[PDB]
Amino acid sequence: LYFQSMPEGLEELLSAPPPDLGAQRRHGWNPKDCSENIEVKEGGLYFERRPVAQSTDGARGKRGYSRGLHAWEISWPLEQRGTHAVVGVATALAPLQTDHYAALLGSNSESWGWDIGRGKLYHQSKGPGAPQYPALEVPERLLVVLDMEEGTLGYAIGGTYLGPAFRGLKGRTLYPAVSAVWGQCQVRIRYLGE
């Protein structure tokens, strides 16, 4: 119902055997670049957000991408999402903590996020008038697809690529990112390439 053609190279990335844990750690969550309320585990494979009231808490991947095709799986349990679970990318300067529950990722000019609970897209957005994407229940696993040749961020679920959610990203250096509100949530990142 919503499928779109994939960017060149993505099929091959998805067909390859899963990456070893070492490769996953290298592009995984950065313990040196996350909310003080987040603990990065297993060398970057996942993080756990501590239970902290009235806080939204984000993490960036260790590596920022400015060219080529980049794709990673996010695994984010359904029962650990709460009011605001947002998946996307961030510049190195996006804020990773705020003192209330919100879609922190995508609330400023430094970040772009898909709210996986409500389906809305956030960039420089507090929520009102946020477009729906695709224009669907998001399962535990989603694929994040950052094409820095064309300057797009989009997503796939259940084998179906949904096309760009955000365009016009050319020239930036962008990091894997989420923002989370749920006490003791655990969010996994599995980088596939390139």
């Binding site: 902290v52 806080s55 650990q80 009011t83 529950y101 749920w182 006490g183």
Partner: peptide, 7 residues
């Protein structure tokens, strides 16, 4: 007891 977001 925890709040709406398990905090």
């Amino acid at each position: 007891g925890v709040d709406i977001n398990n905090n």
